RNA sequence: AAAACUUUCAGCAACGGAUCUCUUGGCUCUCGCAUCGAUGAAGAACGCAGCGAAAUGCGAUACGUAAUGUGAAUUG
RNA sequence: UUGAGAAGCUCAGACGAGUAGGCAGGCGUGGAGGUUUGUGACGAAGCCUUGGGCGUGAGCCUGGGUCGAACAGCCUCUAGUGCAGAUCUUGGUGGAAGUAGCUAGAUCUA
RNA sequence: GUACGUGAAAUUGCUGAAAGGGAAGCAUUGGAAAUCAGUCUUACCUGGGUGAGAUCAGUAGUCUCUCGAGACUAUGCA
């Protein structure tokens, strides 16, 4: 399967895919939007806050706050799948960030939604040698 | 098929590879090779003269040696070091055998003649840069020469001699005269001079002046194979543009009496003298062949794949072995298997 | 006689920008009350015979040559005597094999090839 | 050119015949040539394939490699050749199929019916 | 007409009285390499023909010689080969690389 | 399966069969888990046996690959070769010259600069006139160079790199792919003039050793550690990958040693595929073929040559 | 003024199933021939396979038997 | 002086809105007989693309990317031949909208 | 990759870009950013030398045509 991100080869990344998931498309898009760019462990804690009603996902494009749990539950497995796929590669866990996420419309058979997630690393090497 | 291989590092490998031995097959058994000789680059082997069972070996430093293969392992029967002054600018284009005599033409034009028994040394001067020299098998003392910007010349020592002559009085410096000089072919369709560079000469009078009708074929550095016939005229009887790559060397296949040739792209094929076209082509040879030798119904091919390909007269791969080093000349010791 | 054109921009169909079911191919607006057909200000132009180019320059590329479509290597030979006015356009489906035969022949013939570097690759 | 009105020249009808044919009509559609020296020995050109017939593959990825015909798979017009196999995912061998008009028959399985067939078509052993 | 045949320009001519025999229709002569002698050959062979007809043959002889010249100079220069590109090997190597 | 021609039937037949295939695959996985957690040795033996296959593991067997034990015959041949002056006590310093094809453009002039960036002590002369490659190599022999690199560019895209070893060394002809400039690399860096540190990996076969040997001859023998610039040449399924990086070590827990360096790509970044190795200066027609790849044989993806 | 949001354009991924290629189908014309049933027809239902989902086939002699051939395959 | 596709080439002058309507020349699609000794696994047809061109225009030629088995220029023959509409037929898809709300939990949250 | 030939438009999501005071929209003229068009002294003429070849020999043969018009095979290079 070919993803939508120029990264996510074996460089520093692991993937995960969801196909025809039985969740409302609009909810998944808003859930995906807020968690993009956050740390992987930070995103896990935030998702727990949503379950515990400590934090609410903003609704920007599809409008304010809400506490969906089904869409977050779908994302929990994908993120768990994401780190499980990271381990198989053997990456550096403590620096995982959610580099990419995308929710796409599915066949109209309930409105399902494909979900993809890409975890990555942030690095900087000092040049020195001045 | 027992065969001996020369290497550029100077070492010689005696191979007892049997039919069907193909190293590319993981299940196949490797041939039992025995290696000896100096392992230094300054004495790189050049050619594998096959004097009956005796084998004569040149070296990049001129340390010519002799081996007899009737014994296992072979032993150095005779040795020769050439004068260091005739190898200062040239190199051994070829050595070839003619009635108990050794020919050692150089590229600079010089040529040395050595008798194994009488131990007589003769020096002969020739035309410009030599790149192909040959001695007629049937008739003694017939020398064909060729090189870049130097067409084929037929040097003869005995004018007719009507059967043969004594080996001692051959290649007298006053008895050598060119009885035939090749005439360059006419200009091509573009009115460009057809550049001449002979690279290899073979004699084919058996498969096609005493014992007249010299029927011999030469090759070129421009991929054009040119036959010859003195009776017809100086110019080639026929001329074919077989390859784009420069033709490496030429020879005969006694099993079918059909001429074969190769080029510097490893495209070895069996040209036909009656249909005037190439029939078949030895498939599976990668890297330009350093030397090709055939005996009866077998042929040994070695090149920059560092392998010993073996085919038959009807171009069927019999054997294949890996030789690690870079081969320079090959000779089939025995046509029959071990 | 240089290659000069009375207009560069193409003639687009009226309202072809708004819709996608409406094609950009120029269609004459036959609407009875069509003010754009009526040549008002701020509207678009409309093809007229007044827009024709010089008859000694029609079909001429900006470098002065008229494109000539050569299918095979036979076609590139007949441009031997018009190489100063025609340029051997190589058909789009001509394979890379015959495409080199067409370009090498045309180079010696003296004619100009317009798409001589398609599907091929040089090697030194 | 066809001249009989008993024969047809229809891509639709001839393909209907080819893939609508039963086994006793498929046994002639799956024929094989004979080796040149054997072809002239019996003076016959081609014979229908048969189990336990020694053949050599002439075309395809498996060109040259010889064998016998383990079983003729009539319903798809294929020949199953021993040792001419393919490595599946699970390491097993899913033997590829070769069509009967590609291989060449080298050694026939001499049955009593085959001998009559040879001498029926003006041949001899 | 003037048309070359293997590096030599020949002058092909036909007449009304040989128009019914296709084999022997086109009489042919050979035009010499010397361009000045080539033109004397055309006139002494195309004489009393219309000036238009002799005009077009001289142009073709001019235009064919320039072809033969250009064919010669291009051969002299070591011009680059044109190794083509295959759409199947390009794709297969593109996919096999990405996996690597 | 495929026997039944109706489209909607064969979908229902597959989906029913697909669900059944997943169901019994579930129960065999579960019972395997139940028995493996009961006996950890069963898990140990399964892991030590059920190693997933890979192209490298399923590679076809070829005899040219050298063993780990260094063979004396190889060193005897390679101690007096063309590049031996760079490997002997002579320690020749190699200077490089980079040229282009006849009348090229400015695309290469902004990629050859990146090439020159990774190659300190390497000149460049844009090809002008009717001079051919076999004539440049002769001229560079007396000028004081060692190897010669040419960046062929056509259709304003660079595609082939051919390099010869002066004076009569072998010539190699690679076809570049995915050549990305330093700008088109995320988190790119600016490189200095420090001498890069070569690293050559995965060149097991004999022919690959020679191609690796020539590339080693292309670099200055004395690296500058203080600049800590690294140039990587890695061969995998014949696709030689050239990359540049700057490495600074950090404390990494995952790596059992405890230390692991961060990397920042410097540019350039491109692929090569060894199209042909020639003996003597690169001549397209009248050269001697050390190796020319048959394109039909490479289709056996488990077979390699480098 | 950036983000958010809104907008256009490009890359990429979904969505959709047009286009293109064909094709054991349809339609059209011509041509040859004469053949159902109280000796139970057409139709229907129930059965039957080493296992059939439809589908054909078959009738407790059931995806047919006898007989004449062909001559080694059925095939998930 | 070559400028006879005499259906050609050349010269001169004036002129140019347009509905209903009349006349003329062309462009394009499927197939048909002839033809290009046409193109095509070294890539046909198709498709997308801010690549380059050609024509007043209908349209055309070509580069790149995908693609994988057919196709076209010319002279004639032929017709189920050209779409923006028909509250057009069929299929697809949006905004409306996470709205009207309906199944739980505690108006809110799912 | 069985949601399986090609995979168009509508339509939706992600990213990059510029723009974004109640519209947008298109047309002219440019500018800017981004990007392609195409580059070519090289050949001609003249001078000599050097080796050549031939459609040239104060030359010899064969083949097909219609004496001489072709294709060649020797031989010399004036």
UniProtKB/Swiss-Prot annotation, chain A:
| Biological process, per Gene Ontology | cytoplasmic translation
**What are its GO cellular component terms?**
cytosol; cytosolic large ribosomal subunit; preribosome
Q: Which InterPro entries did the record assign?
A: Ribosomal_uL22 (IPR001063), Ribosomal_uL22_CS (IPR018260), Ribosomal_uL22_euk/arc (IPR005721), Ribosomal_uL22_sf (IPR036394)
The subcellular location is: Cytoplasm
A GO MF annotation of the entry reads: structural constituent of ribosome
A Pfam match is Ribosomal_L22
Keywords in UniProt for this one? Cytoplasm, Ribonucleoprotein, Ribosomal protein
Asked if Cytoplasm is a keyword of the record, the answer is yes
Superkingdom assignment: Eukaryota
Its principal location? cytoplasm
The note filed under miscellaneous reads: There are 2 genes for uL22 in S.pombe.
Subunit annotation? Component of the large ribosomal subunit (LSU). Mature yeast ribosomes consist of a small (40S) and a large (60S) subunit. The 40S small subunit contains 1 molecule of ribosomal RNA (18S rRNA) and at least 33 different proteins. The large 60S subunit contains 3 rRNA molecules (25S, 5.8S and 5S rRNA) and at least 46 different proteins. uL22 is associated with the polypeptide exit tunnel.
Q: Which family does it belong to?
A: Belongs to the universal ribosomal protein uL22 family.
Name this protein carries in UniProt: Large ribosomal subunit protein uL22A
Gene encoding it?
Answer: rpl1701
From Swiss-Prot, chain B:
Q: Name one GO biological process term.
A: ribosomal large subunit biogenesis
Is the keyword Membrane assigned to this protein? no
For this UniProt record, the keywords arranged alphabetically read as follows: Nucleus, Ribosome biogenesis, rRNA processing
One GO term describing the cellular component = nucleolus
Q: Give the main location.
A: nucleus
Entry-linked InterPro entries: WD40/YVTN_repeat-like_dom_sf, WD40_repeat_dom_sf, WD40_rpt, WDR74/Nsa1
Q: Which domain of life is it from?
A: Eukaryota
Compartments in which it is found:
Nucleus, Nucleolus
Q: Which family does it belong to?
A: Belongs to the NSA1 family.
Binding partners and assembly: Component of the pre-66S ribosomal particle.
The UniProt function text for this chain reads: Involved in the biogenesis of the 60S ribosomal subunit.
The identity of this protein, by name, is: Ribosome biogenesis protein nsa1
Give the source species. Answer: Schizosaccharomyces pombe (strain 972 / ATCC 24843) (Fission yeast)
Swiss-Prot record, chain C:
May I have one GO cellular component term? cytosolic large ribosomal subunit
Sections of the chain in a coiled coil: none
Q: Which PROSITE patterns match?
A: RIBOSOMAL_L32E
Q: Where in the cell is it found?
A: Cytoplasm; Nucleus
Q: Name one GO biological process term.
A: cytoplasmic translation
Main location (coarse class): cytoplasm
Q: What does the UniProt keyword field contain?
A: Cytoplasm, Nucleus, Phosphoprotein, Ribonucleoprotein, Ribosomal protein
Q: Which CDD domains does this UniProt record tie to the protein?
A: Ribosomal_L32_L32e (cd00513)
Instruction: State the superkingdom.
Output: Eukaryota
Q: Which residues carry this modification: Phosphoserine?
A: 74
Q: Name one GO molecular function term.
A: structural constituent of ribosome
What is the protein's known function?
Answer: Component of the ribosome, a large ribonucleoprotein complex responsible for the synthesis of proteins in the cell. The small ribosomal subunit (SSU) binds messenger RNAs (mRNAs) and translates the encoded message by selecting cognate aminoacyl-transfer RNA (tRNA) molecules. The large subunit (LSU) contains the ribosomal catalytic site termed the peptidyl transferase center (PTC), which catalyzes the formation of peptide bonds, thereby polymerizing the amino acids delivered by tRNAs into a polypeptide chain.
Q: Extra notes? A: There are 2 genes for eL32 in S.pombe.
Family membership, please give it: Belongs to the eukaryotic ribosomal protein eL32 family.
Q: How does it assemble?
A: Component of the large ribosomal subunit (LSU). Mature yeast ribosomes consist of a small (40S) and a large (60S) subunit. The 40S small subunit contains 1 molecule of ribosomal RNA (18S rRNA) and at least 33 different proteins. The large 60S subunit contains 3 rRNA molecules (25S, 5.8S and 5S rRNA) and at least 46 different proteins.
- This protein is called Large ribosomal subunit protein eL32A
UniProtKB/Swiss-Prot annotation, chain E:
Can you tell me which residues the record assigns to a coiled coil?
none
Q: What residue intervals hold the motif Nuclear localization signal?
A: 87-92
- Cell compartment(s), UniProt: Cytoplasm; Nucleus
Q: Which family does it belong to?
A: Belongs to the MAK16 family.
Name of protein:
Protein mak16
Organism in which the protein naturally occurs: Schizosaccharomyces pombe (strain 972 / ATCC 24843)
Full-protein interval shown = 52 to 151 of 302
